[PDB]
Amino acid sequence: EFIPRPVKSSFREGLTVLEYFINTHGARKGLADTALRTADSGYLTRRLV
Amino acid sequence: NSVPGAPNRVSFAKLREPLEVPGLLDVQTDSFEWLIGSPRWRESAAERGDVNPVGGLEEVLYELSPIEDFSGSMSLSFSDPRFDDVKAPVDECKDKDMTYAAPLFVTAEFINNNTGEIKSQTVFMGDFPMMTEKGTFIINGTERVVVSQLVRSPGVYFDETIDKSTDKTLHSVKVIPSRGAWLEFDVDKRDTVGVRIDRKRRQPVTVLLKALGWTSEQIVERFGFSEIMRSTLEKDNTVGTDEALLDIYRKLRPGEPPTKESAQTLLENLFFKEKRYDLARVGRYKVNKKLGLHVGEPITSSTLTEEDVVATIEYLVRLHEGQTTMTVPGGVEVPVETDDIDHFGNRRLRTVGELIQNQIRVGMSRMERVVRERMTTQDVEAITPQTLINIRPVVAAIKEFFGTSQLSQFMDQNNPLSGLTHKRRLSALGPGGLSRERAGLEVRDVHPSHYGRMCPIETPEGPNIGLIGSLSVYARVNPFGFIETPYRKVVDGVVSDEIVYLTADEEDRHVVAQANSPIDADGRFVEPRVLVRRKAGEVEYVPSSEVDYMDVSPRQMVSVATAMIPFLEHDDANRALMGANMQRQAVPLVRSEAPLVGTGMELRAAIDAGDVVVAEESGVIEEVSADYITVMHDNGTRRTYRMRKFARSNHGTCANQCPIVDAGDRVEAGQVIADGPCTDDGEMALGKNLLVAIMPWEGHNYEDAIILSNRLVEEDVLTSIHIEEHEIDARDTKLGAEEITRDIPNISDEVLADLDERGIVRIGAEVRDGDILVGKVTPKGETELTPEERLLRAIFGEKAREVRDTSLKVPHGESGKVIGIRVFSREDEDELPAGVNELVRVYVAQKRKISDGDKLAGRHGNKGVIGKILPVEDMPFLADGTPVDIILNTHGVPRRMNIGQILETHLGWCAHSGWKVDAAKGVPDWAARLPDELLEAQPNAIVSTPVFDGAQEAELQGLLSCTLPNRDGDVLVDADGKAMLFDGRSGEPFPYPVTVGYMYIMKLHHLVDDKIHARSTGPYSMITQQPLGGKAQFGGQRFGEMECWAMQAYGAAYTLQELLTIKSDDTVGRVKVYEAIVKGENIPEPGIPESFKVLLKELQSLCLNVEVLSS
Amino acid sequence: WLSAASFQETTRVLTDAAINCRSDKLNGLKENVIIGKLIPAGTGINRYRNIAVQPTEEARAAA
């Protein structure tokens, strides 16, 4: 889902503690999903070939 | 600075902190002290919860005691577990491959009541391994570290589910105790309530309640509001307490004839008897807190209770009804809600002490069973506790844990930061934890309760992403294994100086403010609505007169390693994670210059890593050398610190220590006396400051490649000492005893020049690949001699040559000098493994220089290999003529969002050049809030930038504006941090100014010398004739299924056939192809692979008639 | 059945093949790879593997 309070600042001006916390939330979710997706795509292409 | 010898490091921090960082080794040290029962932990428990101070050993001894026989007239008990002086010092234990341990004694008392007898003895329970002052264990000369693990705390957990068939809300509860049988309740799709226990999908709650001795009238009078399960009761179709017990027995115990008493005794033994079911103390506390049973009582009776069971059922039915508050009869009022399984209020931390206690418990259970059998068998009135207790199970269990367990790992010591991060690390694998294949995205995610407990940035990037993390820099471990963090309190709107440690349970019942809030320097908040964290982890704006807690300081949310990353808030999360992970892979160089721009965490990390000698007592320094340092204390006594030199670490890196003190200077307690591998002046220094331009150059830095000057190779700026050890042993064999000797049969004389009379290479002799280190020969006698070999022997007149020389040779692919030799022999009282009469280890060191293919990195995840080392003349240079030291591509910065590295570059150039803010008419507006003693910095100054209370963009812009010239009047770097560079090849000035500065660059442990591999023909496996794998053997590349698919897609069949038949499996094919390739003829036809024949035989062995038909 | 067993459900495929006494013609690419003979694709086709080259008559005369 989307947190109602977004990050008002940018990386140029620097982020705050909670802003970095939520950014880390999103980044960790993405880093896990790509790792799973690699193996999933490998299985899919193995079946296809 | 709180450190007497701390070098001055001006800081940009705007807000002060109330409390200093605690001991970074507390998580291990305090736990081990609790396990031992030391007086320090006794005092700690007395000052904090003196109600029941008991160590792990005392607790397990009291739980096991008193062992009772069937008769009951005689019994055994254990008490007073005491320790003894250690066997040997840590250095001696590491050198002689011993185990740093200490004897353990237990006062055993055997009592006999039939006639009256007391037998008191001091039984030697074994040699308990000890923990050094740095939180490490020494096992067989190796430094092992036990990483604390994260496990679900035993207790009661509620969950909610949507069936998705009728969209009906269902609720379930699980009571999971450690070392016990599951308890489960749920509501089904219909109104029926299920108590599926030990995987038996029947017996609704009513039959269990009846078996518990509860009448139907009692059930309806107590649990009356629950109309759904009241209807379930009306549909129980099983009336009678005895009938309920009969049903429960006949289901959970099939095959046995139920009896009147067996049902009751089995129902009791299943849950209410601690011999087969017991929640831990933490589990009992969690259940009591959840159900509001006891609030002013100590933890006892760890087994489950019928009152607890009925309270759980009431909680489940009330939660399903939609209630939000329950007062259990005889208990306090508690909220009613589901429990998150990944919340840190339930994910407890099993530490080193807890793991050791569990292993001791297993060993002592085995010992108790053995001793009970022995004391039943042996005669009475002639028995002794010494003759009763046998310590073999206990010592076997402790050895089986401390060795060969994934929760006790090698202490990687690439650098002190790597060691300190290996300690205070929270894993999620091993026994009692989820597996990597078992793991899921939900557990791998980040929880809002992680704030201040587990850092969400520092974690491995491999397949275990999210399963391993690091403790927060301010975190602490509560007595029950729950991670708690300190936070200050606010009253009336003013922040006090009081600090209270809060577990994640209470943090949901409060409103925690923000660390860098606009404090008014009096206590009030200048801005009414501030950003805070609410109960459910939400962040929102709340008026200042409503918050009740505040963060102690910034960086509380971050670990120790990541806290050393400057401008962290300017870096993206993934790149910051990459940089934090790479910080622990930096090798220690020969100088390790301190960084120009850093944070305040480096000094504390270096101090707490234990790699720098510190003055235990204040005093003057009497004499100083390269090996030892003598300190003349105040009270007459003097101390001598022995300083290790060129000691090989776990990963083959030097651990040199150097004095930093003089011959007359005074030193106070805690002051750094000698710096270690990656320390400068007492603060961590994992890299070097390099002059960097961030423009592309001729494509040699294309796609994350890095360009460097040749002066880095020349001046030894980036060089590392790598020490590798080689071992060989002489052991008795059926044909006699192999001996180490310089007399090797049928060898040349030149190759024996470096061997002394002992047969071992002389110290300091340069060695290269293919040489001989230890001259060892074994008794082979003779084998089948072919006629050609007989002819050769009889024509060259060789003697018997009765022995075969399996001498030690250096591995293929490295060289270097010889440091020292350690010789072990059983003829000199030295203890060796049985059958071995001589052991020799040779240390080889290489002064490895920087080269192309090596991996360099920054502190912001900007890694890269070295594309090309350029000559110093052919590099860009400023107008002053100083060439740039390192060139990085500019296309990698904006895409990856790591502008913090450019911020660090600008600040590093400012620090190197020095600055002075012209306060002619007041300080400028951007420098108004800038702290004093920072308005004027000498050249080559060192500044500290806290991760979140760092230097602002306006302040750094002003500092770049005031950038006082270098030697003559010249400002090489303009206002916006750029400069004009002259091309070193063509000579024309570069058309546009490029950004230049000073950046901290570290050399990672990915040297190409350790990765280059090639193979033409080597060893093969036994079952199948495929070549081996890995650089340990000669290797051989893995041509996998994807490679086969690509080969087939290309349409080239001959190359695939060759890669499969004559290069891997066909033995005659290999021999013939080698013969053809040496004699010059063309490659012969491939044959049938051996793996196919192996598969055919395997299929035939499975009673399958498989054959091949030619027509 | 060789290709099916190497792909997936090895025990089930082997049991079914053994029960049905099935035979593999070894004409498939995967089984050719497994047994080590030339795959029936690309340079493994007969029309490409069984070509015969020889110097031209004028070239041989001039040689």
Next chain:
Amino acid sequence: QAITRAMADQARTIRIPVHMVEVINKLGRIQRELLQDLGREPTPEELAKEMDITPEKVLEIQQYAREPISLDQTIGDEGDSQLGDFIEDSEAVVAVDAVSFTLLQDQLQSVLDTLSEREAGVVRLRFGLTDGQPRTLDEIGQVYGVTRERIRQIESKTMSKLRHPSRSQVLRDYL
């Protein structure tokens, strides 16, 4: 008796006779008893004194008591590969010493051809090069019609002249 005999017969992968199993268990039991009594692991000499047997036999029993390990057990920290993937093949042909051996065969054939036919044949049937069997003095005498003493003399002369510098230097590298 039946249980103990069956345990001794079928407990270990490598069969050990009961006469040795009994002494192995006795040595282990009294070794643990001595360790318990003394507080330190008993030394091999103490164990030998307790056995009333020599320390060499004590050590032989100790090394006999070892059991084999599974070749298929996981060796890595995680489950990636088995121990059987880390063991070489001693009996496998190295594919280079075979080429060295056949070239040595050709060179030895040429060197033998450089000498006289009589001496070359004497050496060949004496060392068994044409066939596997190295013939005896009586055999070479009866197949060549020469006295055994004369055959011994000519064999010694052939060996001495085959030790000659150029032949020795040529054959030296093949070792």
Next chain:
Amino acid sequence: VRLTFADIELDEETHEVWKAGQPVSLSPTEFTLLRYFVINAGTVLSKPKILDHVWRYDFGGDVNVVESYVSYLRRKIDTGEKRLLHTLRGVGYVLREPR
């Protein structure tokens, strides 16, 4: 260049053996057998090993000739029934020093 162990001192060049320092004569085959034993002191040599090296390569006889030679050498140099020429059943003979 001499080959010695404890009380046995064999000089090949002069072709003599010393057992506590008096002349003693041996048959040749026994002499080269003693030379093979002394050159490999402390290491057991197998019976086919000894037959192939110290006897001729194509020895078509039976093994016990080596045991007769060993008995000859023992009664020649090892007077007592506790010997320096040890025998290991099924593995062969060796010349160590008793411990």
Next chain:
Amino acid sequence: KRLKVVAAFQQSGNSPMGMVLDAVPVIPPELRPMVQLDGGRFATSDLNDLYRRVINRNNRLKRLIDLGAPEIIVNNEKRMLQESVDALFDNGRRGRPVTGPGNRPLKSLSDLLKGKQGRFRQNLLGKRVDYSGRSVIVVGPQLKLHQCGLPKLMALELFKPFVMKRLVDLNHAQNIKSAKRMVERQRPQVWDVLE
């Protein structure tokens, strides 16, 4: 679903008696090697234990039936023999698997045929290959499209027989043994012919 197997049995020449076994085969010992590794310790192939268990159960059963035993004892022995055979073929298929030291399940015959680490995928489709190498990658912007830069030590090791034969032909070494010696020592006269 019953006919799909009944008719398959009917049409072919095989017999449904193949389900039961009166005798089982034994894989060749080289496919189940027992090797004395360095240090005197031994290593077994984890199939010898199952075969030994089956042999022990069969011998005990035949001894019991020859001597004369109660029918319940004979039936228990027969059940043990059947369980041992099932463990040898498909360990863990029925009930808990038979486990060795360290509480790890013994691998059976079919256990080395299924899965990614099984023989079919890990040893037949893919293979370890000689005359091959690996190392890190750097940028080669001065090279052409059809060219790559190979380390000289890596290329020497890869092309070892080629360079050995060529240097023997050039009379730099008298024979293959000397050629191998000079290649291993990396003599200066090796790179010139290596190019």
Next chain:
Amino acid sequence: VTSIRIDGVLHEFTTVPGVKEDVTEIILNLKSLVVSSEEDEPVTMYLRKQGPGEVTAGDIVPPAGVTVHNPGMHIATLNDKGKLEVELVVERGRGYVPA
């Protein structure tokens, strides 16, 4: 200077007894020596010091025909038990040549 030699050491990774300085860091300090030679052949110069003091580049005796130019640069620091004895061999050349 291309090669050095200390009497009490055997390789660069040891420590001379009595001197606070290490061998490797002594080498690195010696890296900053500037000289001027007139003889192309290798030339040896000596440095001998004993007693408590800071040995610099002014205590090294250059043979005639060569010149040292930075004698005030620091080399090592000794103690009462300290004793330094090193020999430096120097040659001409151009550019950077590794060890």
Next chain:
Amino acid sequence: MLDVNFFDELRIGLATAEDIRQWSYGEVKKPETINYRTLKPEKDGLFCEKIFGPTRDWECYCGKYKRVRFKGIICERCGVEVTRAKVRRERMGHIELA
């Protein structure tokens, strides 16, 4: 069936007792693998030379034949067949179930 890479078909099917006995080169009836002292395979054991071929090339159980000339002749004293030890990777055994 001649291993010449000329395979028209590859067949599988259920194996009967007669087929298993045809495959088998002998019957193993002893759960012994290696002698603990001589380190040699035991007779009629899981590694029996008589059943599975000689351990060493051109060698009988004790050494009555040790030459390549004795091609394919079984030893009268032991019963092993003098051939290449690689046949130990091809010969198959069987056991008779009670």
